[PDB]
Amino acid sequence: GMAKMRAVDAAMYVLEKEGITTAFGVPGAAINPFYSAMRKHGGIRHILARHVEGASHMAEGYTRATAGNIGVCLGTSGPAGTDMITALYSASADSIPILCITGQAPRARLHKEDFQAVDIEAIAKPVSKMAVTVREAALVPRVLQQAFHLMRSGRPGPVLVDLPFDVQVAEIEFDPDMYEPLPVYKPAASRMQIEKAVEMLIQAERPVIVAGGGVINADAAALLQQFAELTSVPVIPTLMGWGCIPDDHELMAGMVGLQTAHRYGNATLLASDMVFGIGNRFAQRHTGSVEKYTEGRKIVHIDIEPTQIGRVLCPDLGIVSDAKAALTLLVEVAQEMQKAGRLPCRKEWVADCQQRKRTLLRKTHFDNVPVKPQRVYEEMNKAFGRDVCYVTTIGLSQIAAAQMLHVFKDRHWINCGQAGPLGWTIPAALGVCAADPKRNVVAISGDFDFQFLIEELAVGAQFNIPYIHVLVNNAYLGLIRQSQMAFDMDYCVQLAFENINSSEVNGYGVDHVKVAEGLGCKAIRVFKPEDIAPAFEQAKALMAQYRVPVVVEVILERVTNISMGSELDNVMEFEDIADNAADAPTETCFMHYE
Amino acid sequence: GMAKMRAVDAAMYVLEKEGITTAFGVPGAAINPFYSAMRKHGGIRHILARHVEGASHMAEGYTRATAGNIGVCLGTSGPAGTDMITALYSASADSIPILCITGQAPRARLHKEDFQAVDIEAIAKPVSKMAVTVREAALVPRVLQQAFHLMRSGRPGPVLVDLPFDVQVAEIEFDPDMYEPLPVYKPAASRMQIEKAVEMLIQAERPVIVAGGGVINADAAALLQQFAELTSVPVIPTLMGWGCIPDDHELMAGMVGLQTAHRYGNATLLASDMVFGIGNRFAQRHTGSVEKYTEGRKIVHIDIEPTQIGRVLCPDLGIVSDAKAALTLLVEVAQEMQKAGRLPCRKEWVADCQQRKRTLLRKTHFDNVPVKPQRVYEEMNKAFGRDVCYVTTIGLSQIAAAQMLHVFKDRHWINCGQAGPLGWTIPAALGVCAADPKRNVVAISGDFDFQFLIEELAVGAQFNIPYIHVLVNNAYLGLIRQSQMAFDMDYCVQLAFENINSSEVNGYGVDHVKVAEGLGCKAIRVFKPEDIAPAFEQAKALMAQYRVPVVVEVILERVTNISMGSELDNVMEFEDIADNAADAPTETCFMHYE
Amino acid sequence: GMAKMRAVDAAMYVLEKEGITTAFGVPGAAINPFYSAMRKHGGIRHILARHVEGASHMAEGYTRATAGNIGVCLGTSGPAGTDMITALYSASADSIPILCITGQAPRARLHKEDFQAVDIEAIAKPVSKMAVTVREAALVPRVLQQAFHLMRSGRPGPVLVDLPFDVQVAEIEFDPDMYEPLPVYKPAASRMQIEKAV
Ligand SMILES: Cc1cc2nc3c(=O)[nH]c(=O)nc-3n(C[C@H](O)[C@H](O)[C@H](O)COP(=O)(O)OP(=O)(O)OC[C@H]3O[C@@H](n4cnc5c(N)ncnc54)[C@H](O)[C@@H]3O)c2cc1C
Ligand SMILES: Cc1cc2nc3c(=O)[nH]c(=O)nc-3n(C[C@H](O)[C@H](O)[C@H](O)COP(=O)(O)OP(=O)(O)OC[C@H]3O[C@@H](n4cnc5c(N)ncnc54)[C@H](O)[C@@H]3O)c2cc1C
Ligand SMILES: Cc1ncc(C[n+]2csc(CCOP(=O)(O)OP(=O)(O)O)c2C)c(N)n1
Ligand SMILES: Cc1ncc(C[n+]2csc(CCOP(=O)(O)OP(=O)(O)O)c2C)c(N)n1
Ligand SMILES: COC1=C(OC)C(=O)C(C)=CC1=O
Ligand SMILES: COC1=C(OC)C(=O)C(C)=CC1=O
Ligand SMILES: COC1=C(OC)C(=O)C(C)=CC1=O
Ligand SMILES: COC1=C(OC)C(=O)C(C)=CC1=O
Ligand SMILES: [Mg+2]
Ligand SMILES: [Mg+2]
Ligand SMILES: [Mg+2]
């Protein structure tokens, strides 16, 4: 029971009681007492990163992988905290938590200029739900207790706790047996709100549900699918909702937006007369101009956060609610409406949506040498099972991936959709694998993304964390080249050079096979489209044999323009479209997944 | 003359008029208009980085390399700005400027949740002299004009300018012929202040001058040496003042502090009866407890910043002045005192200091296999010329390097002494080489530092920026291991693993030769101490031949405890000391440098 | 039912549903649309103060008198908000709420040195649970809805809502019949805790 211990020792009991089992971090002098308490306690597995930014993105991937997870990132004073800001921003922007813990200079030296001491509280405030330098040892467990309530409550977001060295080592009295986590705050919709929502949905003749990341955040994916099935309403996931209904479900109508979207998704949204928004916001990359997105449509919006409602457009009905509480009531009310014979039949509208999904395609089956990227994603759909979990960040790699890959369970698309920091992919994928060693993790990067934090592959080697990394290499910042076409230029976006150690990369610059191997991983390079599939097979075998990351690098043609535009009705198709399965053979309409 | 142009076009004329010729950066959609204006203008050479943090530390190295330089770092919106915070902190903490320029979302979308848009103004405020989102196109040249005044004036520090996309492209009328830079503010000491300072110096019987980074910041190194020569007063540089008097000068008395210090420097400081501080602050790693540092000593402190004076101790005489203005007057007053026969002879005190410098040494000449790090620095002193310019960051690598390497001109020790962010070394060294292609740049890293931003070597390959990187590899976070001895542990600090592609690294984990070669550079690995010198010779040859970075990796013994302690009189010597030149042959007392 | 109205008309329905019946204030040009909506709605009794600091402490006394009360303090842009800071500090310091509402310059002119315009959001942040300039008219009811949650939940404290003139007068669709106050967050001790204390 009650006993004298260091404040960091009480902190270990608190993290244990809050369900922490894993941490990613980089030790330093100012945070050694915490590491000492973590060693003495046991039962937190620590993974040492090779950049503090790598530890922070591993924590993000750990959070995102499984509902209720909270990744922990640990660092010393000074530059470790400033290296965590990009991750605090990324987690804040997507409404997910990580817990960052930094060492700090002793309290009495906070406003002197002590070595490697910085005002991390002020720097991190704009990108956290709480950022606090703890000023008393007895407050260390209470701040952690309040941190966990905030990471779980309302709109979730990250917390940074900054620990002065003397606060860490100071003795306190603490009783772990008496510690209890705080209740989680989550507002719930009333029946009056939900019956009104179902009333408007029954009155719409061509409705769609837009299912956002809040559905997954609430762990409500099964309820979302059940509600759509009862009402026979087609479902359009946002990028952050992707996976909350399987891609081969008859009601899954594609994705909508300016970039990570399908031609059939956009066409179905513009044909609809109602958008039933659950756990989405209405992001600019999803809507385009809001006047066009809402034209002729009733808009319902359910969000856990009151000030998200009305932020970018005025809904016809806005409801403050956790997505699981709201969907429980929506299923119950729809079941009552079904018993009463009041749910309209929707066979015609559903058939129109399925006809769009069958015909408005983009070509993937290219035999070109050098390889066209869209062929890579077709081969990934064939090579990996329906249980595949993809990890990606940003670039033409990621946009075409979202256009062409398919996903079948929630939290099998792991993507930092609002902030998009380059370098996220490798550490996030390691964090997913740490959360779930049985997860079939496959990452997608372009060459530039892959280079930012390439050193994290050695983390996978040192700790034997296996996954497959697909690397699509155009020796370009490809997304920025394509955006520069409006300025009639191609400037500071090329990565090619004659590699003095590798004439076999043919002027593409970095030799990613050699780099990955020096970092202790396995790697295969592919020049021809017919060699992609066997390469994925060797990679699975190499992964089982050595239990390290395996990189499959595909050498792309230098220049491919991915489909995108400024409005839902203005997306330009640069590459070939398709209206037949032979050109686009991995659409779920044509292919049985696993 | 006067003409209509985009605000970014006016920004190019302003940067030109302010002497900018180089930028380091990573383009993105939100900052494309600036890149378009930079392409159209010509005459700024852009170096594309492979991490935004790499661009920001390149800018720091460019600033530090040459007086009056200001490195420029360019990035897009969102995570690019958050990736610059560590560099803004590093530059702020050492009182040096960089100019960071980020793209931003259009003004009318700043408080919506636009894609990759973040409140970088609020995040960067604690670590900049100015951080401003520019809200009008006509203000773009005025903000840059005020930025340059602030980067040069008072205590220097960095500025971040955040540019909304619509502000960048908006047309304005601007006349480059009428643009003029603002005057620089620098307070100057009065003759009354300086005559009082010289009076106290003449009254001291055993004075030392402590010459800080402010002397170099003011470009006053030649005046500092001249003043010390006229007064015959021994000079103790801080780590940030190192190089402002040559290490082989008869008055250079060593360095003082808890870590980057000499046994003879500390012994000379504790024997002195006055510290004449010029352009230093009195940093905790330099002083230890201030009660012991000041015991029995008069303290003079000259600083350009009023609130630096008295911050950590109360000087007997504090003077607000730029170091060059103050040293001009100090030379003039000392010349008057010399003509008047009023400067005391100091042969005895100088002889005592030189006797300490001759006898209180640390051994470097180790024949051990595996190699002892101190032998590496002895070989670096022999291999490179007196014009060598070292670049380093932090770790046992850097601390022993500062204890054992020697430097002979100001701005030939390039070191982020207050913030110490891992990964700084490679990009800072590239920035020094970009500032001065004739500089003989040699970097020193440990393996962990080297891994953080290892991908930046490919920048050196793509652009042919040659320098030598000395990599001392213990497969450890060595400084953190040594600090963990107080907690009787060795925990989360090892980087070793059996590399499945390289049994020749013998369980040291990452194969840095293979990684460096895949990045397009050259690399040599050394296992035996007698092979270090030939390796430095091949590296010079490989560098001349291929004009890329050349890495020389020395395989160290896993565990070496560097000398350090908690007070000037409490530094523990773990490894062998020396009192004879055979054990420490590269001290300047024994070796003629070049 | 749902109807077109100004954002400030919707704010009156929200204040009504949240139980406000009284306000203490000093009008000015930048907060006139709010006063117009209060007058049209009726049923908030306004008491005119003879110093903005006096309205702000009237609001404190109104809160403290009766459990569940929330005093409301109204003022115009500029110095009216800076005159409310001492009350926001005093309410925060004692863990009690007041709701301060200030007028503000229109959004397009927020960083333009417009007459009597100040960054009250930044000034009031240290002494409030929330201090916010509302940047969309449709957000006015939602900001007020979150404010009442914050003033009642956890450790109570005050909120300042800052309303740009153009946000006040813009039209929105709002249904007073569908508005519902948010649930109040109040942690409870477990029986294991209370038995240990006894
Ligand atoms: C290059 C690139 C291109 C992209 N292209 C597109 C595109 O074409 N189309 C597209 O849609 N996206 C696209 N995205 C992603 C886009 O930027 C957004 O991240 C995404 O649209 C937001 O999804 P969402 O609306 O579900 O919001 P989320 O960020 O997932 O959040 C939605 C809401 O969930 C709420 N919430 C949180 N927890 C709960 C809970 N328990 N219950 C209820 N609500 C809760 C939050 O308050 C928030 O308002 C792209 C991203 C990138 C990097
Ligand atoms: C691992 C490690 C170990 C270290 N060990 C030591 C050690 O043992 N000893 C040691 O001394 N350092 C050590 N350092 C470096 C130390 O942390 C400080 O960076 C350094 O001591 C500060 O030097 P300084 O006093 O010259 O200050 P600076 O940071 O260089 O600044 C001094 C002053 O210059 C002023 N100034 C700026 N411009 C001008 C101008 N134009 N004119 C006049 N004044 C101006 C500023 O206002 C400031 O107050 C170590 C660093 C690391 C990373
Ligand atoms: C830190 C950071 N800097 C800049 C950007 C802007 N950005 C988005 S995509 C991109 C290029 C990515 O190139 P690569 O990963 O090679 O992918 P490709 O588009 O070529 O497939 C850049 C620079 C960003 N997202 N993050
Ligand atoms: C971003 C960041 N995280 C952590 C630290 C703390 N730190 C200082 S030195 C060090 C280990 C450096 O090891 P290496 O570069 O291998 O050098 P060695 O001490 O082994 O010679 C660490 C983690 C830091 N300075 N910066
Ligand atoms: C993409 O790499 C770059 C070059 O190489 C072609 C250049 O010549 C110039 C001027 C800029 C650049 O970024
Ligand atoms: C019969 O199964 C199929 C569907 O569901 C009806 C579809 O919607 C589409 C587009 C293809 C298909 O095979
Ligand atoms: C330094 O690498 C590490 C290990 O490997 C020896 C471990 O076993 C554990 C438990 C932590 C660790 O960081
Ligand atoms: C004669 O040159 C020399 C000195 O200067 C007098 C010294 O101070 C020392 C320590 C060695 C030396 O050779
Ligand atoms: Mg890196
Ligand atoms: Mg690319
Ligand atoms: Mg090391």
PDB file of C-alpha atoms and ligand atoms in Angstrom, chain A residues 446-448 472-478 495, ligand 10:
ATOM      1  CA  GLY A 446       7.718   7.832 -52.104  1.00  0.00           C
ATOM      2  CA  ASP A 447      11.510   8.225 -52.127  1.00  0.00           C
ATOM      3  CA  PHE A 448      11.514  11.643 -50.397  1.00  0.00           C
ATOM      4  CA  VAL A 472       7.949   3.832 -55.170  1.00  0.00           C
ATOM      5  CA  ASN A 473      10.957   5.763 -56.463  1.00  0.00           C
ATOM      6  CA  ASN A 474      10.640   8.485 -59.109  1.00  0.00           C
ATOM      7  CA  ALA A 475      13.745  10.488 -57.961  1.00  0.00           C
ATOM      8  CA  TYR A 476      11.341  13.446 -57.577  1.00  0.00           C
ATOM      9  CA  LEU A 477       9.277  15.337 -55.050  1.00  0.00           C
ATOM     10  CA  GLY A 478       6.469  14.211 -57.314  1.00  0.00           C
ATOM     11  CA  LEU A 495      16.531  14.097 -56.349  1.00  0.00           C
TER      12      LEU A 495
HETATM   13 MG    MG D  10       9.278  10.764 -55.324  1.00  0.00          MG
END
